[PDB]
Design an enzyme around this catalytic site. Structure first.
Site, PDB file in Angstrom:
ATOM      1  N   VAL A  13      -1.097  -6.032   6.849  1.00  0.00           N
ATOM      2  CA  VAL A  13      -1.158  -4.755   6.152  1.00  0.00           C
ATOM      3  C   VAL A  13       0.171  -4.014   6.214  1.00  0.00           C
ATOM      4  O   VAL A  13       0.549  -3.330   5.255  1.00  0.00           O
ATOM      5  CB  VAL A  13      -2.294  -3.877   6.718  1.00  0.00           C
ATOM      6  CG1 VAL A  13      -2.325  -2.519   6.029  1.00  0.00           C
ATOM      7  CG2 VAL A  13      -3.632  -4.585   6.557  1.00  0.00           C
ATOM      8  N   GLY A  14       0.893  -4.128   7.324  1.00  0.00           N
ATOM      9  CA  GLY A  14       2.170  -3.443   7.454  1.00  0.00           C
ATOM     10  C   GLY A  14       2.651  -3.448   8.888  1.00  0.00           C
ATOM     11  O   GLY A  14       2.287  -4.326   9.679  1.00  0.00           O
ATOM     12  N   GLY A  39       5.035  -3.820  16.452  1.00  0.00           N
ATOM     13  CA  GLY A  39       4.118  -4.910  16.205  1.00  0.00           C
ATOM     14  C   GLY A  39       3.828  -5.081  14.718  1.00  0.00           C
ATOM     15  O   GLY A  39       4.446  -4.473  13.847  1.00  0.00           O
ATOM     16  N   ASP A  55       4.812  12.498  17.476  1.00  0.00           N
ATOM     17  CA  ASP A  55       5.136  11.887  16.188  1.00  0.00           C
ATOM     18  C   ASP A  55       4.009  12.136  15.183  1.00  0.00           C
ATOM     19  O   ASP A  55       3.402  11.219  14.633  1.00  0.00           O
ATOM     20  CB  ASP A  55       5.404  10.393  16.359  1.00  0.00           C
ATOM     21  CG  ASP A  55       6.119   9.786  15.163  1.00  0.00           C
ATOM     22  OD1 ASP A  55       6.871  10.511  14.479  1.00  0.00           O
ATOM     23  OD2 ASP A  55       5.933   8.577  14.910  1.00  0.00           O
ATOM     24  N   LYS A 113      -3.721  -5.445  16.002  1.00  0.00           N
ATOM     25  CA  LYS A 113      -2.291  -5.208  16.188  1.00  0.00           C
ATOM     26  C   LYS A 113      -1.737  -6.315  17.084  1.00  0.00           C
ATOM     27  O   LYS A 113      -1.730  -6.192  18.311  1.00  0.00           O
ATOM     28  CB  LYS A 113      -2.057  -3.823  16.786  1.00  0.00           C
ATOM     29  CG  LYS A 113      -0.601  -3.410  16.887  1.00  0.00           C
ATOM     30  CD  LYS A 113      -0.485  -2.009  17.461  1.00  0.00           C
ATOM     31  CE  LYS A 113       0.959  -1.578  17.610  1.00  0.00           C
ATOM     32  NZ  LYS A 113       1.066  -0.238  18.255  1.00  0.00           N
ATOM     33  N   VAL A 160       0.297  -5.261  12.053  1.00  0.00           N
ATOM     34  CA  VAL A 160      -1.102  -4.869  11.938  1.00  0.00           C
ATOM     35  C   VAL A 160      -1.734  -5.710  10.840  1.00  0.00           C
ATOM     36  O   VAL A 160      -1.210  -5.775   9.722  1.00  0.00           O
ATOM     37  CB  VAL A 160      -1.248  -3.366  11.635  1.00  0.00           C
ATOM     38  CG1 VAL A 160      -2.718  -2.982  11.535  1.00  0.00           C
ATOM     39  CG2 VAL A 160      -0.552  -2.543  12.712  1.00  0.00           C
TER      40      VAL A 160
HETATM   41  C1  LIG Z   1      -2.654   4.320  13.626  1.00  0.00           C
HETATM   42  C2  LIG Z   1      -1.082   4.575  13.486  1.00  0.00           C
HETATM   43  C3  LIG Z   1      -0.539   3.588  12.472  1.00  0.00           C
HETATM   44  O1  LIG Z   1       0.600   3.311  12.463  1.00  0.00           O
HETATM   45  N1  LIG Z   1      -1.482   3.006  11.535  1.00  0.00           N
HETATM   46  C4  LIG Z   1      -1.031   2.045  10.539  1.00  0.00           C
HETATM   47  C5  LIG Z   1       0.034   2.397   9.676  1.00  0.00           C
HETATM   48  C6  LIG Z   1       0.478   1.486   8.722  1.00  0.00           C
HETATM   49  C7  LIG Z   1      -0.144   0.212   8.623  1.00  0.00           C
HETATM   50  C8  LIG Z   1      -1.221  -0.143   9.493  1.00  0.00           C
HETATM   51  C9  LIG Z   1      -1.670   0.763  10.433  1.00  0.00           C
HETATM   52  O2  LIG Z   1      -2.724   0.421  11.313  1.00  0.00           O
HETATM   53  C10 LIG Z   1      -4.016   0.655  10.794  1.00  0.00           C
HETATM   54  N2  LIG Z   1      -4.280   0.576   9.505  1.00  0.00           N
HETATM   55  C11 LIG Z   1      -5.498   0.798   9.067  1.00  0.00           C
HETATM   56  N3  LIG Z   1      -5.830   0.724   7.674  1.00  0.00           N
HETATM   57  C12 LIG Z   1      -4.862   0.550   6.567  1.00  0.00           C
HETATM   58  C13 LIG Z   1      -5.324   0.079   5.328  1.00  0.00           C
HETATM   59  C14 LIG Z   1      -4.431  -0.089   4.258  1.00  0.00           C
HETATM   60  C15 LIG Z   1      -3.072   0.219   4.435  1.00  0.00           C
HETATM   61  N4  LIG Z   1      -2.087   0.053   3.310  1.00  0.00           N
HETATM   62  C16 LIG Z   1      -2.543  -0.253   1.956  1.00  0.00           C
HETATM   63  C17 LIG Z   1      -1.458  -0.075   0.866  1.00  0.00           C
HETATM   64  N5  LIG Z   1      -0.227  -0.401   1.334  1.00  0.00           N
HETATM   65  C18 LIG Z   1       0.614  -0.437   0.364  1.00  0.00           C
HETATM   66  C19 LIG Z   1       0.201   0.511   2.286  1.00  0.00           C
HETATM   67  C20 LIG Z   1      -0.894   0.894   3.297  1.00  0.00           C
HETATM   68  C21 LIG Z   1      -2.619   0.690   5.650  1.00  0.00           C
HETATM   69  C22 LIG Z   1      -3.522   0.860   6.729  1.00  0.00           C
HETATM   70  N6  LIG Z   1      -6.494   1.099   9.899  1.00  0.00           N
HETATM   71  C23 LIG Z   1      -6.316   1.196  11.199  1.00  0.00           C
HETATM   72  C24 LIG Z   1      -5.057   0.973  11.689  1.00  0.00           C
HETATM   73 CL1  LIG Z   1      -4.748   1.087  13.439  1.00  0.00          CL
END
Ligand SMILES: */C=C/C(=O)Nc1ccccc1Oc1nc(Nc2ccc(N3CCN(C)CC3)cc2)ncc1Cl
Length: 288
Positions: free
Chosen positions: A16-17, A20, A127, A35, A22
């Site tokens: 997802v991004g 670390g 943050d 993560k 995720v």
């Molecule tokens: C909890 C702090 C943090 O940094 N969370 C976080 C940020 C970015 C990416 C992942 C992360 O983690 C989680 N992410 C989610 N759910 C989620 C769903 C979809 C997306 N995308 C979809 C579209 N793209 C383009 C960008 C973002 C990101 C995150 N849920 C829980 C957690 Cl811990």
């Protein structure tokens, strides 16, 4: 008070991004965000994070379900993405109301206050920014988790001994951001230090045309240079809670599209994105 999961149960889906990486996953017939660890060098980093992610339990904070081989973390998957993505992400962007903006901020102050009230030591987030504010339940329930110069109190990057009043500064900036649906200090740009220099000099986001004076007052107090002149999160929660009386409808999911366009900042005052007509209406009925 943790939980252990056979890494064989984790049905690792896609990334997802990104500290670390995720990855969206599944685990016991639910969606789950995991993560992974990127290298041995991050072994110790994951430790301190799990010491506090156990102490912490609150509705507006990301839930840690529970596993460690390779070092992993099992948290709830916010299907809505980051608040930053909702406000400024890839189109089509959802339409939201003044009540959504206020509810988001209220729910955020509630989560932070729980951290400020942590025992024995007050846990400071340090943050606070929309990228770290995730949304669930049709975008109506905000939850906290762990280029920040736009949301950073001027005493933090000043190196001074700071407190929990730096989150109050972040919150103040976020309140201006959901009301205007504008990135704070997108006109400054450049590297981070050019924003740090501006905020340190006293620069703040422009004032909002036709903003209710109660909201303007709270917003500006939150981003005073003197941290002691900023209200506590307990005070913010209280005030936001009583203002919601005049912002009904925060329960309606985001589902309507929006072709959002951004007027330049004509004459140091910006137009809000949300509409306050219903607020002035409900307010006059109680007062006059
Ligand atoms: C909890 C702090 C943090 O940094 N969370 C976080 C940020 C970015 C990416 C992942 C992360 O983690 C989680 N992410 C989610 N759910 C989620 C769903 C979809 C997306 N995308 C979809 C579209 N793209 C383009 C960008 C973002 C990101 C995150 N849920 C829980 C957690 Cl811990």
């Amino acid at each position: 008070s943790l939980h252990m999961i056979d890494y064989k149960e984790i049905e690792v889906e896609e990334v997802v991004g990104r500290f670390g990486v995720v990855c969206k996953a599944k685990w016991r017939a639910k969606d789950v965000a995991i993560k992974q660890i990127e290298s041995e060098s991050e072994r110790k980093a994951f430790i301190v994070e799990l010491r506090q992610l156990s102490r912490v339990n609150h509705p507006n904070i990301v839930k840690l379900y529970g596993c460690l081989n390779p070092v992993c973390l099992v948290m709830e998957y916010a299907e809505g993405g980051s608040l930053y993505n909702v406000l400024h992400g890839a189109e089509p962007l959802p339409y939201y109301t003044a009540a959504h903006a206020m509810s988001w901020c209220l729910q955020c102050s509630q989560g932070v206050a729980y951290l400020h009230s942590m025992q024995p030591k007050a846990l400071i987030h340090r943050d606070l920014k929309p990228p770290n504010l995730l949304l669930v339940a049709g975008g109506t329930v905000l939850k906290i988790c762990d280029g920040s110069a736009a949301w950073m109190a001027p005493e933090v990057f000043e190196g001074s001994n700071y407190s929990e009043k730096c989150d109050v500064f972040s919150w103040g900036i976020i309140l201006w951001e959901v009301i205007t649906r504008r990135k704070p200090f997108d006109e400054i740009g450049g590297p981070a230090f050019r924003i740090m220099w501006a905020v340190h000099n006293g620069t703040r986001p422009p004032l909002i045309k036709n903003l209710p004076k109660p909201i303007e007052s709270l917003m500006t107090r939150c981003w005073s240079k003197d941290p002691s002149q900023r209200p506590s999160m307990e005070e913010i929660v209280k005030i936001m809670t009583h203002l919601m009386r005049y912002f009904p409808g925060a329960d309606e999911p985001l589902q309507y599209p929006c072709q959002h366009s951004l007027p330049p900042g004509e004459d140091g005052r910006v137009e809000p994105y949300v509409d306050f007509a219903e607020f002035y209406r409900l307010w006059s009925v109680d007062h006059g």
